[PDB]
Design a binder for these strands. Sequence first.
RNA 1: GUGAAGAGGGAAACAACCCAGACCGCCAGCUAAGGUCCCAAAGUCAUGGUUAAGUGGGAAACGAUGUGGGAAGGCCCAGACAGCCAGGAUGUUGGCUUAGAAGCAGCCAUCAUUUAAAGAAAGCGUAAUAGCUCACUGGUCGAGUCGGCCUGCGCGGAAGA
RNA 2: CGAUGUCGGCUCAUCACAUCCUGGGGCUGAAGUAGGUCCCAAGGGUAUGGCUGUUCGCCAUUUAAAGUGGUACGCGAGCUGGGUUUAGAACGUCGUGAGACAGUUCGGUCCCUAUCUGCCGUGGGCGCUGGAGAACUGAGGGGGGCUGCUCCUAGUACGAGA
RNA 3: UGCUGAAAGCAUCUAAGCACGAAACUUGCCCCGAGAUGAGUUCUCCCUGACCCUUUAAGGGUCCUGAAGGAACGUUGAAGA
Lengths: 38, 209, 176, 6, 123
Amino acid sequence: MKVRASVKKLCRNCKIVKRDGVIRVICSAEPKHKQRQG
Amino acid sequence: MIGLVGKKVGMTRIFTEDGVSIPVTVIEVEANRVTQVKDLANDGYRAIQVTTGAKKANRVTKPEAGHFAKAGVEAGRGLWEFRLAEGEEFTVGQSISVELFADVKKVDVTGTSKGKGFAGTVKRWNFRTQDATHGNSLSHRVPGSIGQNQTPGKVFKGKKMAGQMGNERVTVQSLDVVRVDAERNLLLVKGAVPGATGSDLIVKPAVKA
Amino acid sequence: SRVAKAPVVVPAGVDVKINGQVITIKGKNGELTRTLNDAVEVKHADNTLTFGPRDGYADGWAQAGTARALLNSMVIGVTEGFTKKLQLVGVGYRAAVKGNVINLSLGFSHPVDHQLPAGITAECPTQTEIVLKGADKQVIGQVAADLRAYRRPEPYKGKGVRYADEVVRTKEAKKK
Amino acid sequence: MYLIFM
Amino acid sequence: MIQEQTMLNVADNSGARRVMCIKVLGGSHRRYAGVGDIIKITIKEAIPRGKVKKGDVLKAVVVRTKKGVRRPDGSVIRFDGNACVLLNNNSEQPIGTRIFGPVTRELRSEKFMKIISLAPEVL
RNA sequence: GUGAAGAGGGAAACAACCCAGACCGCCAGCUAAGGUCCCAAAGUCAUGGUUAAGUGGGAAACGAUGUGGGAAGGCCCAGACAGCCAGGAUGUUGGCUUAGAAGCAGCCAUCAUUUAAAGAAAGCGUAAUAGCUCACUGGUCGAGUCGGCCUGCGCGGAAGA
RNA sequence: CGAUGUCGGCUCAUCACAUCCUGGGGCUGAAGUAGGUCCCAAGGGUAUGGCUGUUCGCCAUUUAAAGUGGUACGCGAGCUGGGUUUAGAACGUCGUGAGACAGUUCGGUCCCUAUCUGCCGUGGGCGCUGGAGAACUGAGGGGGGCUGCUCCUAGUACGAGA
RNA sequence: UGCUGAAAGCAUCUAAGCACGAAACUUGCCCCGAGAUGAGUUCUCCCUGACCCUUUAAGGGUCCUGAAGGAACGUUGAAGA
Ligand SMILES: CC[C@H]1OC(=O)[C@H](C)[C@@H](O[C@H]2C[C@@](C)(OC)[C@@H](O)[C@H](C)O2)[C@H](C)[C@@H](O[C@@H]2O[C@H](C)C[C@H](N(C)C)[C@H]2O)[C@](C)(O)C[C@@H](C)C(=O)[C@H](C)[C@@H](O)[C@]1(C)O
Ligand SMILES: [Mg+2]
Ligand SMILES: [Mg+2]
Ligand SMILES: [Mg+2]
Ligand SMILES: [Mg+2]
Ligand SMILES: [Mg+2]
Ligand SMILES: [Mg+2]
Ligand SMILES: [Mg+2]
Ligand SMILES: [Mg+2]
Ligand SMILES: [Mg+2]
Ligand SMILES: [Mg+2]
Ligand SMILES: [Mg+2]
Ligand SMILES: [Mg+2]
Ligand SMILES: [Mg+2]
Ligand SMILES: [Mg+2]
């Protein structure tokens, strides 16, 4: 889980979802590509 | 569970056959006669009220002697209350014996501490003394500093300072019941209980696990 | 809206009783209840339900497609039910059903026990498998996630409780 | 001796 | 009650004659070391041809105290002087081969099973 | 320009900011800046929108299918986007290098066929291959779909005694 | 500037979180043990000595850890007086000299009976609606919250072995 | 960290709904506590006379009466300046 100020899609499997008022990035193939904005 | 009211008789020792010293405190638990039973529909909470000992008939006042004559019990030296649990019921006038603690393994004993009077901060709050030598000027056992400068500019509430120590109600928890002696109204707990010899103690069973 | 406009065909012999916002469905497998949102409108028709956005509410199309799919799966649960299969991977890992309790032994120092809620009945064909029968979809899905939460699959040997329809990713350990 | 601020 | 700077006699044949306690091991802000407690020492005196040299920093175990130990029936066993046995820094096995004077039953465990085997008397 | 040498009303309190220049009295009225739910005088006023953050009532580069508006563009009933079932190839180990490189360590080109379409294959992986996989084309489905610009109001970035 | 006492030590603390330990998690180039990094969390806890006036630092040995900062670089109407700062004296250096140093060295008076606020204790007066003696309820407030090591599970899971 | 689930035929921990989750928070443990002027509750005890006037009203006065209890004094205390 990366906590940074700019979250992005790092491959073609990443998905940007807004959960509870926080922009997150969910990846189905690479658990390294997990990000939240903070 | 309800408790009983006793009297600190003093400390002694119990020798076991494997050669152990057990410091016990002797508590004379006379029978506790129930004076008044409280309920939800009249008092808002469930409790019984017990009295113990005996009082001189020329020393009981007219308000107090009428409260005992309503129950039929004889006038003891005081009145204490105990909160009932769900499933306990008692009747007015019923005497409770020391056999309440027959299979109770641990008790909590609460009493009034000894009075140390006006005690300084070295005795009361375990402060450190300053130097007894090396130049010290009239400042050996004084507290020192009691605050900071202009911010806040006041001493905080709850500051540790000299004052009245002791003579207060304290509860010592989880004492081993060593021996219950029902035929002479005794209860031997293991260890030191609060109070001087001859003071009232309230022995309730242990609430902690 | 693409989900909310395809109607739910009610099959033969399931009592669909609509009372305001509270819906009840009886059937061959059991009786289920789901209090619907205020923003959806349900109407009984010729053996077929319909869901529409109630007026005076802004997000009625989104609430309709959910209320559709939850009632679409209620009529499956009272007719054919649901199922979940959980298999155990790792030596000395075993399960056992005794009543409505599952007895898992997953390499701990104590034995663990899971009390199944009313509506789920588990059975173990093999000692390294669990089959869960249920009439609700969420409850059969949550119970399958609680047994999985005891010992989740590790990425090095695959050990732990896993679904039978779930592929576990594994990876080599770090070279010295 | 540090007698006056200076 | 052994604390820091306390000079102890030595109760084995390792060669040291007086050692000084420089640390009480086994806790933060720890004050005292009774009988059976490891201490960290330094050697102040030594015989010329012993196994240890003056100035060495070793571990020890306190076997006698002038303050004494207490038994579960209230008894006390005191001694006329503080004594210890030098242990190795890491293996914590006794360096010497003999123990002098009596020791107590507080050392009776698996850690110090070799000290109460060489002891002339156990109280 | 104001204070100094200037009171009054507003900006919570606040010489220098805004409105405005106190001769004295009144238990009269009209306005200025500023305001009208309660503290506290006056609209819980009327019509049309926006916000969902208590934003309003601290803070930037940067980030994001938050949401309202506008003008255009691509594909679409000869069937669009998504989902699904399929195929997805052989020449070819294209040649060079490498003990191996066979599309996928590195260099050069990158066609022919059968067809409905398929690459000298975008990526994973591997001793290398294999393997999965995407581009492309069928069938199913039966109504919109895709992503750039200009913009209004919001979200994160946002830790102190 | 008709005076707001300076560095350090002692004593007593109190707050922030940018967390040192303990607590809960994501990623790991995370096999296990042990780590790296990030997120949440301020309840508690958070060394003894040698040298030096030292804060700091280095060193010795511990500890679960020996946090970072604010509070007039917290604290002299609470203590000390070691220091770069009165008057004595000497060295080196500069000046013809009186003297001076940004250099070092030995010696050198630290006052205050608490009116007000604040805080720690402890009482008197009146109220609470006839007076009185007891026992309570509990709105509210305060205290407390740390942690090591050994053994079992088990030399099991993991690991080629260690 | 999830379950079910659309907006967005899929996917999705979230928008509706549901379940876990820490020494932090609210309790549970101990102590003070009805000046809590919002001054609370329960139990018991005590007082059951006559007359006059003005400013006629929670009015003032005379004679008799003095209760429950309290204080005060003494002997003092593991209580205390
Ligand atoms: C016996 C009693 C005497 O007090 C002392 O000896 C104390 C110990 C002095 O400190 C001693 C000791 C010392 C170190 O100061 C503590 C030193 O600096 C002074 C010069 O002498 C004090 C306090 C000095 O004040 C201080 O004077 C400084 C010049 C400035 C300072 N400032 C913060 C206001 C101020 O407080 C000063 C000058 O004596 C005060 C003036 C009024 C006097 O002369 C008075 C009459 C003194 O003789 C005295 C009160 O009788
Ligand atoms: Mg003096
Ligand atoms: Mg003195
Ligand atoms: Mg103030
Ligand atoms: Mg003005
Ligand atoms: Mg004003
Ligand atoms: Mg008004
Ligand atoms: Mg704001
Ligand atoms: Mg002045
Ligand atoms: Mg300071
Ligand atoms: Mg001061
Ligand atoms: Mg001089
Ligand atoms: Mg100078
Ligand atoms: Mg002084
Ligand atoms: Mg509390």
